[PDB]
Amino acid sequence: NKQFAVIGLGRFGGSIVKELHRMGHEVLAVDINEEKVNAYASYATHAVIANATEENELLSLGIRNFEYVIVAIGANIQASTLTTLLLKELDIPNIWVKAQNYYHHKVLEKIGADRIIHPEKDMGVKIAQSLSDENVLNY
Amino acid sequence: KQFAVIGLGRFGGSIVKELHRMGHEVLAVDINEEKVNAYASYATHAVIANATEENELLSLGIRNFEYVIVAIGANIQASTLTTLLLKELDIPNIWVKAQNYYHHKVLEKIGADRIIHPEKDMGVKIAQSLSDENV
Amino acid sequence: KQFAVIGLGRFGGSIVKELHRMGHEVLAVDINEEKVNAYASYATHAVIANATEENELLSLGIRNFEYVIVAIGANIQASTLTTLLLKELDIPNIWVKAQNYYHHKVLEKIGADRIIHPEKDMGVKIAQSLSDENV
Amino acid sequence: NKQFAVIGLGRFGGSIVKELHRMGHEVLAVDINEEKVNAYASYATHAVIANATEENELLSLGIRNFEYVIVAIGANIQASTLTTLLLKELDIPNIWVKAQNYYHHKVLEKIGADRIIHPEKDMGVKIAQSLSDENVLNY
Amino acid sequence: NKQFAVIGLGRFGGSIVKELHRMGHEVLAVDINEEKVNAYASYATHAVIANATEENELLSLGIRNFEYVIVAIGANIQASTLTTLLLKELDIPNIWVKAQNYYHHKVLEKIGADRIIHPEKDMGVKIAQSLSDENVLNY
Amino acid sequence: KQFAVIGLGRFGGSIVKELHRMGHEVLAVDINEEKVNAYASYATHAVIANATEENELLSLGIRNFEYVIVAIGANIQASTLTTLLLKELDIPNIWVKAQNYYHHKVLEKIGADRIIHPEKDMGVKIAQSLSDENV
Amino acid sequence: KQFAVIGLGRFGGSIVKELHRMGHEVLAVDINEEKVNAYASYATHAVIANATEENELLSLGIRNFEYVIVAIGANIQASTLTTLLLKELDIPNIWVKAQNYYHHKVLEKIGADRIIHPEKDMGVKIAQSLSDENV
Amino acid sequence: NKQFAVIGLGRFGGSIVKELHRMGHEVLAVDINEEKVNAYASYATHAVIANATEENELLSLGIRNFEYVIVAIGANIQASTLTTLLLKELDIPNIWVKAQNYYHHKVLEKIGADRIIHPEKDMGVKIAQSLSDENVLNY
Numbered sequence A, D, E, H: 001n002k003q004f005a006v007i008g009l010g011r012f013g014g015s016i017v018k019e020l021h022r023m024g025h026e027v028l029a030v031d032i033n034e035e036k037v038n039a040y041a042s043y044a045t046h047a048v049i050a051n052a053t054e055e056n057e058l059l060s061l062g063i064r065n066f067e068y069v070i071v072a073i074g075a076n077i078q079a080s081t082l083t084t085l086l087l088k089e090l091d092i093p094n095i096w097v098k099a100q101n102y103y104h105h106k107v108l109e110k111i112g113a114d115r116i117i118h119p120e121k122d123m124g125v126k127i128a129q130s131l132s133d134e135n136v137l138n139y
Numbered sequence B, C, F, G: 001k002q003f004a005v006i007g008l009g010r011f012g013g014s015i016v017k018e019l020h021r022m023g024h025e026v027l028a029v030d031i032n033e034e035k036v037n038a039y040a041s042y043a044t045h046a047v048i049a050n051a052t053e054e055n056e057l058l059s060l061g062i063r064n065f066e067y068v069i070v071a072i073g074a075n076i077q078a079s080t081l082t083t084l085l086l087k088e089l090d091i092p093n094i095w096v097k098a099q100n101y102y103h104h105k106v107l108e109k110i111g112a113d114r115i116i117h118p119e120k121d122m123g124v125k126i127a128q129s130l131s132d133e134n135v
């Protein structure tokens, strides 16, 4: 109960919502855009329309009660940092954030983010790893 | 054995740097010299080249590699043309980063052996990373 | 015998109108209803459809046509994906308007039987039209 | 001698220059951009860098001495109409102009253009014709 | 009856409508924008909302029946030239047009405009004249 | 007798050229050298100067003119400041081109003896020009 | 005694809120209703009005105030016209926020008793605030 | 010696540099733009051209040795927050920052800024105070 919450349902965020659901996990999916919230209705325990930067909507959401909260806001560094800021204020156990660039990463580190994700770069490392496995582990 | 990465953006450059760290040799290539220089220290050989040019593909020796990764980004046309050419050279394993849905669809019909979607794929990784929290 | 034009822009719509004037039957198709209506009076059948969707391609019956013209413009990805699909249906003659050089290059390797370049092609027409001045 | 002149060396204009050259015809190729003029050096009797809207450069060019002058200016209705305007003033026997749209066509008709070309539409008719030939002429 | 018609009710056009009305003249005021048409309701015999570039609306307007028609379209060279083009087709006795610049002037001359107005420059001459009068006519 | 035009745009330059044609002497001034040169042949003296600078106004000798025309355009602030300064120098006749309604309103309270509105004013001219058709 | 603030931006609204906190009565005014509402709870009376309109200035009763602050921002013309009008009403103290140098220059010649430059002025405050560190 | 440093020489920053100088205080003035640095040459002990967001240039500057450092970067929230971030890393005793808006303020609070300045609002309070003084203190 109330273990995972994902804010920002783009390619990255919506993808963790789907995988979680597939794995049988309950998940809180949120976005400011309603068309996005309706797109993940069949995958989330609860899919709410909310502005993550709004300190009150965060309360109506009950976000203070989640062990992990993922901020997957995309090309909006401000909404992303602001949200992570409020989350850190609600003392959320684990806040993971998708970073847009170096600058964003630098502020997130000090803003409270426990883990920063750089999709492009990070996948680059995992692809390198798969390549190595193909030969090293020989297969 | 052989590894070749075409397109040294955040995705492509990252795989070159990782392969290097993991003690692997890698051919790094990009049409932009500035990109090639940024990864020269990580690749066995870093070469400036337009991957859509067959002649540049041959002077490159790309046909001799076991795995070639197409990491072209925004230039979707170059990406699909490049993988079309690599397919003609019968490269054993051609992996391509997909820009979008239509792109993925052409790539699968074009001969891409593996199609990568950084955002989506990383998303699944994070979900699985999230579960392991109680493993 | 059968003629099918996908993409009713200036180029595509024009060919539909001409075929009609020349007493030929033609299937007109476009993803945009507004475009489909604009040529409804010129085609035997004008249908709204996304040419990249295999199911819409089948409910359309496109596989039964002798000549299919892909006149998608700016959406280069839809254009190449659409011709890739038509090729799977073994359409006898698939003619495609090329947006640019890379586009032409993928199209030729993809199975386009004829590649049209309005600007260039019309340019040759005008030159030949210019000479005839003294013929 | 001095039969054809092409102003505007884009896909359309450069293409008539090439075809003319292939057919053994002498041609005057002009453009305001030097990189364009250098690209058609091996196809034109003479390739000059000039602003077709400049009334003087038109004289230095000797354009008044050509039977046919093609205005192949692209996405610049103003430069296109202006040029055709000056050409009509020099009393050029035949002025052909590539039109961008309906509006452009309407002004060109009254401005002096003897023939208006709409590449996209016009090629559409010729493609229809080729299709008909495939079946009608049976081949 | 049906002597003057003004198309384009901006500062320039609306001003001739007002002056005409003050002088006791009947005037046809037209504009595509309704807020403009409503602003000159108390000054024009008839104030209609119409697109001057639309060949049909020009007929519904009855513009073919006016001795003078003023095209006072502003920063829209295309709508301005297009309108003057249609007007010249309806064989209007006198078509006066406000020109935006040199290019516009050049096309209007050939498009049919009987008189071209350049507010800024033209007023400049009249101001020079007033200055001269102050001293020469001594007053 | 003395005439001075500040701001050589279409409006201001035009009055300088007309005064010249009418055999009158005129001081032409503008902050932009390019504008000053364009009218150098029409003015007795064409000087580059920022009309808002009192010192440049004095080295100019503007205070000795009977009529000074402020034809600054878009820079409404410079326009009103310039006329404020000319008023301090008690110039007998200061005529100013108004950019808009608020501008006209400040100018009248500031000391502008005549406020010109090219668009509106020309509009009245045309209406009167229209009537004379049957005079 | 009487205080009137025209223009409820960050600067103007702030002074209204402070005066309120300090137990002072204040007339808040702005052409934008949304701005007027935002400060309705802080002013004795918050009124929507265009400060450039003499009639709205009279129905407002502005002429009865000892201090009137013009805090119009970007609309420099409204700002100078408004202070020009207040000067006609002989308001004892008219303080105006200056947008820039030319603005300050017109304002001083127009009758502004005090000209405020938030950025500059606050800058001096901080410097003096910095020194006091060792006082 | 090395007491005050001001980064960003706009209206706000340049103004504290001037006042400090007038009061006989030594001050370090810095900006990325050279024309700005040259404008405050006669007011600062030292006026250097540097990118405050560059971690190295901050070292060449010797900023680690100042009791107070003012970040007066204007309409560039990113450069402003980034700089304050590096400054907080160098453990500067007092970092004051000009905030552009609420969002900026919120990040600065957590980023390390010891004092946040909102020129417009803050001056508003001081103006209110001057008004009160006029009457209350009666003068």
Ligand SMILES: Nc1ncnc2c1ncn2[C@@H]1O[C@H](COP(=O)(O)OP(=O)(O)O)[C@@H](O)[C@H]1O
Binding pocket: A007, A008, A009, A010, A011, A012, A030, A031, A032, A033, A036, A050, A051, A052, A053, A072, A073, A074, A075, A076, A079, B119
């Ligand atoms: N303040 C916010 N609160 C909640 N969700 C937001 C907020 N701002 C943006 N979002 C959502 O986060 C997502 C942005 O991630 P993004 O990568 O841009 O989507 P995509 O990958 O499809 O382009 C969008 O679905 C957007 O609606």
Ligand SMILES: Nc1ncnc2c1ncn2[C@@H]1O[C@H](COP(=O)(O)OP(=O)(O)O)[C@@H](O)[C@H]1O
Binding pocket: B006, B007, B008, B009, B010, B011, B029, B030, B031, B032, B035, B049, B050, B051, B052, B071, B072, B073, B074, B075, B078, B079
């Ligand atoms: N035809 C081509 N041949 C070789 N490299 C190319 C070609 N087209 C694009 N590239 C390279 O592929 C890379 C794509 O990464 P990209 O996503 O566009 O930049 P980024 O990852 O920083 O956002 C670029 O560095 C680009 O120079």
Ligand SMILES: Nc1ncnc2c1ncn2[C@@H]1O[C@H](COP(=O)(O)OP(=O)(O)O)[C@@H](O)[C@H]1O
Binding pocket: C006, C007, C008, C009, C010, C011, C029, C030, C031, C032, C035, C049, C050, C051, C052, C071, C072, C073, C074, C075, C078, C079
């Ligand atoms: N996937 C698709 N399936 C069917 N039609 C499409 C598809 N994508 C684009 N089109 C249509 O192809 C036409 C291309 O003509 P276009 O050049 O883009 O407009 P225009 O010729 O006026 O400049 C458009 O009318 C567009 O709606």
Ligand SMILES: Nc1ncnc2c1ncn2[C@@H]1O[C@H](COP(=O)(O)OP(=O)(O)O)[C@@H](O)[C@H]1O
Binding pocket: C119, D007, D008, D009, D010, D011, D012, D030, D031, D032, D033, D036, D050, D051, D052, D053, D072, D073, D074, D075, D076, D079
């Ligand atoms: N005033 C001018 N005089 C001469 N040439 C011009 C003028 N204006 C534009 N051109 C040229 O006409 C051509 C425009 O045709 P265009 O279709 O835009 O080129 P492309 O097909 O490659 O996009 C360009 O080569 C341009 O430099």
Ligand SMILES: Nc1ncnc2c1ncn2[C@@H]1O[C@H](COP(=O)(O)OP(=O)(O)O)[C@@H](O)[C@H]1O
Binding pocket: E007, E008, E009, E010, E011, E012, E030, E031, E032, E033, E036, E050, E051, E052, E053, E072, E073, E074, E075, E076, E079, F119
């Ligand atoms: N096609 C058109 N048909 C009729 N009126 C038009 C057309 N296009 C523009 N107008 C009108 O002509 C006027 C433009 O003159 P303008 O100078 O731009 O107004 P203003 O002086 O207030 O800026 C506007 O009132 C506009 O609505």
Ligand SMILES: Nc1ncnc2c1ncn2[C@@H]1O[C@H](COP(=O)(O)OP(=O)(O)O)[C@@H](O)[C@H]1O
Binding pocket: F006, F007, F008, F009, F010, F011, F029, F030, F031, F032, F035, F049, F050, F051, F052, F071, F072, F073, F074, F075, F078, F079
């Ligand atoms: N402070 C000033 N002192 C002197 N001249 C000025 C000042 N400010 C602007 N000007 C000049 O006044 C002229 C105004 O004419 P303008 O309307 O702005 O250009 P245009 O008439 O071509 O549209 C410009 O040439 C400008 O350089």
Ligand SMILES: Nc1ncnc2c1ncn2[C@@H]1O[C@H](COP(=O)(O)OP(=O)(O)O)[C@@H](O)[C@H]1O
Binding pocket: G006, G007, G008, G009, G010, G011, G029, G030, G031, G032, G035, G049, G050, G051, G052, G071, G072, G073, G074, G075, G078, G079
């Ligand atoms: N003519 C006017 N009469 C009364 N109030 C006005 C007038 N013009 C502008 N204002 C008001 O003055 C205020 C100026 O503050 P401003 O700086 O423009 O916004 P902000 O302080 O948020 O940046 C605005 O709220 C505006 O509505």
Ligand SMILES: Nc1ncnc2c1ncn2[C@@H]1O[C@H](COP(=O)(O)OP(=O)(O)O)[C@@H](O)[C@H]1O
Binding pocket: G119, H007, H008, H009, H010, H011, H012, H030, H031, H032, H033, H036, H050, H051, H052, H053, H072, H073, H074, H075, H076, H079
């Ligand atoms: N990264 C940076 N490092 C140092 N100085 C900077 C940096 N970014 C901006 N600045 C400077 O800070 C100042 C911005 O303050 P600003 O308010 O915009 O100036 P102004 O008040 O004249 O508009 C400018 O002088 C700018 O050059």
